[PDB]
Amino acid sequence: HKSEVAHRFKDLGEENFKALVLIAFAQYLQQCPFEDHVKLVNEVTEFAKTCVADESAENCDKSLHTLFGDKLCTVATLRETYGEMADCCAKQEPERNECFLQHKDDNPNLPRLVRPEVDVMCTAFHDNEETFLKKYLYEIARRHPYFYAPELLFFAKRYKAAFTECCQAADKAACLLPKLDELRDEGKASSAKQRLKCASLQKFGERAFKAWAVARLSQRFPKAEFAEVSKLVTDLTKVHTECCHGDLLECADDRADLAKYICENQDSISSKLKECCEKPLLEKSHCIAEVENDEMPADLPSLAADFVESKDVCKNYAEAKDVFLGMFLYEYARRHPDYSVVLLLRLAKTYETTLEKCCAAADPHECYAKVFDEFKPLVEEPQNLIKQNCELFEQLGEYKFQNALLVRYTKKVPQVSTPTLVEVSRNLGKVGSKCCKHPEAKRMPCAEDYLSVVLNQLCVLHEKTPVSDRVTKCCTESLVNRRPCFSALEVDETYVPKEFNAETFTFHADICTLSEKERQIKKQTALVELVKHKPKATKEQLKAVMDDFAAFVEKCCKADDKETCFAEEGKKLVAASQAAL
Ligand SMILES: O=C(O)Cc1ccccc1Nc1c(Cl)cccc1Cl
Ligand SMILES: O=C(O)Cc1ccccc1Nc1c(Cl)cccc1Cl
Ligand SMILES: O=C(O)Cc1ccccc1Nc1c(Cl)cccc1Cl
Ligand SMILES: CCCCCCCCCCCCCCCC(=O)O
Ligand SMILES: CCCCCCCCCCCCCCCC(=O)O
Ligand SMILES: CCCCCCCCCCCCCCC(=O)O
Ligand SMILES: CCCCCCCCCCCCCCC(=O)O
C-alpha cells in the first residue's frame, strides 16, 4: 500500500469507487450543487487511475485523508458558503480531518425531498440512468452526513433494480410504489438505528454495549466457543466506537478487518458464512451482518450445572463478574434464537441481581438455587403480549387492528398530537402484519426489531415537543425497559375531555373520492378526535358509533346528491352520537 488511492480503487472497482467518492463529498460539502460534486469525483477518479497505473507517480503516496482534505480546501467558495469550515484548511492534517468531521451539519436546512410522479421517474431513469440515481444519492447523502456511506450505496443499487423492473411494467405505478415505500421506510429505520445505537453507547457505556453484543452474536453464531464470541464482542465494540465517531475511512477499515477475521475463521464461527465470505470487500461485512442464525448444536445441556448447582459459582463470579455474566448470557442466548435481545439482557440483569445478593448471604448455594424460576414470568411477558396481539390482528385485519390500537393508545396518553397518534397506530398495525405472519419462534425478535424503530421515532418526536412525563420517563430510561415501560402505561384517568367542535366532526363528499389510504387517515383522525372528546366511551359505545358512522358513509357515497346528504345525515349522525355518549 504505497498508494492508498490506488489500493482502494483496485478493491472497489471504478464504479463503486466513483459512487463512494460522491457520497463522501456530498456528506461534507452539503451545500454545493450536484454538478460541482461530479467534477470533483471525476478529478479524484482521474487522479486515482494515475496511481493504479503507477503507485509512484506524484502525490499517489499521499494518504486518503490528506487527498480528500486537499480537495475540500480547493473549493474556492468554501469560506463564503460554509464559513468556519474553511478555517479547517489552516490546520495541518490529523487536526484538519478532525475539524472537517466536526462541521458536518446533521439535519441542515434543506427542503423536503419530493417523490416525483411515476411517469417522470421512469422517464428520467430511462433517459439518463446514472445522473438520475446519483442525483438522488447526492440528495439523500447531503441530508444525512453521518449515514454509513456504503450502506447508502447499497440502497441506491436496490433503487436501481426497482426502476429497472418497474418502468417496463404494465401498471408501472402499482409495481414501483410499494417498492419505493419499502425502501424509504427501511432507510428511515437504518438511519435512526445508527443514531440510536451510538447514543446508547455514549449514555450507558461500553460494558452495557458489550453485553448487548454478546447476546446478539451468540444467537447468530451458536456453535462458536465463548472465547471466540468474546473476541468478536471486544472487536465489535471497538468498531462501533470508531464508526459512532464518524470518520468514514476508519469506520470502514475497522469493519473490513473484523469481517476478514470472521471469514478466516468460519469453521470456528458459523457454517452459514460461506457465501458472504466469498463477496468482495465492499459487501462482506454488510453481508455478514445480514446472515441467518446458524443452526444450534444438538446436545446442549441445561445451564443448571454451571450457573446454579455448581458450588464455586460465587467464586467463579467474583473472580471476573462481567466475564462470568458474559457466559450466562452467551449460553442462554445461543439456546434462544427466539428471544428478543432485550429479553435476554433482562435475564442477565436478573441473574446478576441475585448472585449479588446470594453470594453475600449466609448460604449462597441455597440462596441462589431456585433462580431460573424468576426467569419464567419475564419470558412469558413478551410472549403473551405477542400471542394476544397477533390473535387480535387475525380477527380484525390490519385496518381494524389499527383502529383498536388507536383507541387504546389515545386513552393512555390523550395529550399526543392527533396525527402522531394516527401515525404510530398505523405503523404499529403494520408491525402486526409483518411479524404475525411468522411462527412463534421468530415473532419476538421480529417485534423487537420493528418496535425499536417505531418506539424510537416516537421518542425523537416527543423530545422535540414533550407532552407527557410518563412518555419522557420511558424514552429516557433504560433502553432495555423502553418497550415494557410503554406496555405498562395506563389509561389517563386524569385527562380532561376535549371541547366539542363540529368542524372536527363535519364530513364532505370529497372523502368518497379519496383513496382507501387517505379515506382511512380521514376516518382514523376523526376516531382519535372522538376518543379525546369522549375518553370514557365504552368499547361497545365506540363500536356502535363507528358502525353508525361507517353506514352513514356508504349511504352518502352512493347517494344522488352526495353533499346535501353529508350535511343532513351528518347533523343527525352527530346529534345521535352526542346523545349515546
Ligand atoms: O425519507 C427520507 O427523508 C430519506 C429517504 C428517502 C428515500 C428513501 C429512503 C429514505 N430514508 C433514508 C434516510 Cl431518512 C436518510 C438517508 C437514506 C435513506 Cl434511504
Ligand atoms: O447488530 C449488530 O450491531 C452487529 C452484528 C449482529 C450480528 C452479527 C454480526 C454483527 N456485527 C458485525 C458487523 Cl455490523 C459488521 C462486521 C462484523 C460484525 Cl460481527
Ligand atoms: O443496558 C442498557 O440499559 C442499555 C440497552 C437497553 C436496551 C437495548 C440495548 C441496550 N444497550 C446498548 C448500549 Cl448500553 C449501547 C449501545 C447499544 C445498545 Cl443496544
Ligand atoms: C482521495 C479520495 C477521498 C475519499 C475516498 C472515499 C473512499 C471510500 C472508502 C469506503 C470503502 C467502503 C468499504 C466497505 C468495507 C466495509 O464496510 O466493511
Ligand atoms: C410523541 C410521542 C408519541 C407517543 C404515542 C403513544 C402511543 C403508545 C405506543 C405504545 C407502544 C407499546 C408497544 C407494546 C404494546 C402495548 O403494551 O400497548
Ligand atoms: C407484534 C404486534 C404489533 C403490536 C405491538 C405490540 C407488541 C407487544 C409485544 C412486544 C414484545 C417485543 C419484544 C421486546 C421485549 O422483549 O420487550
Ligand atoms: C361527539 C360525537 C361526534 C360524532 C361523529 C362520529 C365520529 C366518527 C369517527 C369514526 C371513525 C370509525 C371508522 C370505522 C370505519 O372505517 O368503518
CA 481/CA 499 separation, integer angstroms: 35
493-572 is a CATH 1.10.246.10 domain? yes
Class for domain 203-294, per CATH? mainly alpha
Residue 478 in contact with ligand 3 by CB distance below 6 A: yes
11 is in an annotated binding site: yes
Q: Identify the DSSP state of 291.
A: P
Q: Is 427 in the pocket of ligand 1 (CB under 6 A)?
A: no
Nine cell digits for residue 548: 353508525
End-to-end alpha-carbon separation of the chain, Å?
Answer: 77
DSSP string, 345-413: HHHHHHHHHHHHHHTTSS-HHHHTSS-HHHHHHHHHHHHHHHHHHHHHHHHS-HHHHHHHHHHHHHHH-
Residue type for position 42: N
Q: Confirm or reject: Cβ of 284 under 6 Å from ligand 2.
A: no
CA 355 to chain centre: 35
In the Cβ-directed half-sphere of 390, how many Cα atoms lie within 13 Å? 20
Q: How far apart are CA 200 and CA 542, in angstroms?
A: 41
Rounded CA separation 532/505 (Å): 12
For the CA of 67, the nearest ligand: 4
CB 263 less than 6 A from any atom of ligand 4: no
Ligand nearest to the CA of 477: 3
Task: For domain 1-105, give the CATH number.
Answer: 1.10.246.10
Show the cell assigned to 578. 352526542
Q: Are 10 and 16 in contact (CB under 8 A)?
A: no
188 lines ligand 1 (CB under 6 A): yes
Q: CB of 179 within 8 A of CB of 162?
A: yes
Q: Which three cell numbers stand for residue 517?
A: 389510504
Give the Cα separation of 576 and 581 in Å (integer): 9
Q: Is 547 annotated as a binding residue?
A: no
Output the ligand 7 site: residues, CB below 6 A: 505, 523, 526-527, 530, 533-534, 545-546, 549-550, 574, 577-578
- What is the CA angle 508-512-513, rounded to 5? 110
Instruction: Give 577 Cα–ligand 7 centroid separation in angstroms.
Output: 9
Q: Is the CB of 232 under 6 A from ligand 2?
A: yes
What the block records as the C-alpha cell of 398 is 390490519
Cα of 197 from ligand 5 centre, angstroms: 20
Are the C-beta atoms of 8 and 281 separated by less than 8 Å?
no
Rounded CA-CA distance 188/195 in Å is 11
3-state helix, strand, coil in the chain (%, to 5): 75, 0, 25
Protein residue whose Cα sits closest to atom 3 of ligand 5: 458
Q: Provide the 3-class DSSP secondary structure of residue 535.
A: coil
CATH code, 295-380: 1.10.246.10
Decide whether any atom of ligand 4 lies within 6 Å of the 277 Cβ.
Answer: no
Q: Cα(569)–Cα(581) distance, rounded to whole angstroms?
A: 18
Ligand-binding annotation for 257, yes or no, is yes
Q: Is 390 in the pocket of ligand 4 (CB under 6 A)?
A: no
H-helix segments, 226-340: 226-245, 248-264, 281-290, 304, 313-319, 321-334
**In the 3-class helix/strand/coil scheme, how is 142-162 assigned residue by residue?**
HCCCCCCHHHHHHHHHHHHHH
Query: How far, in Å, is the centroid of ligand 3 from the Cα of 202?
Result: 10
For this PDB entry, the determination method is X-ray
Which ligand sits closest to the CA of 47? 4
Give the domain ranges of the chain.
1-105, 106-195, 203-294, 295-380, 381-492, 493-572
CA of 252 to the centre of ligand 4 (A): 6
Centre of ligand 3 from the C-alpha of residue 177, in Å? 35
203-294 and 493-572: identical CATH topology: yes
User: What is the fold of 106-195?
Assistant: Serum Albumin; Chain A, Domain 1 (1.10.246)
Task: Report the nearest-CA residue for atom 5 of ligand 6.
Answer: 428
Q: Which three cell numbers stand for residue 175?
A: 409495481
The domain 381-492 is placed in CATH, from the list 3.40.50.11440, 1.10.260.40, 1.20.120.920, 1.10.246.10, at 1.10.246.10
d(CA 503, CA 526): 11
Helix axes 248-264, 149-166, angle to 10 degrees: 80
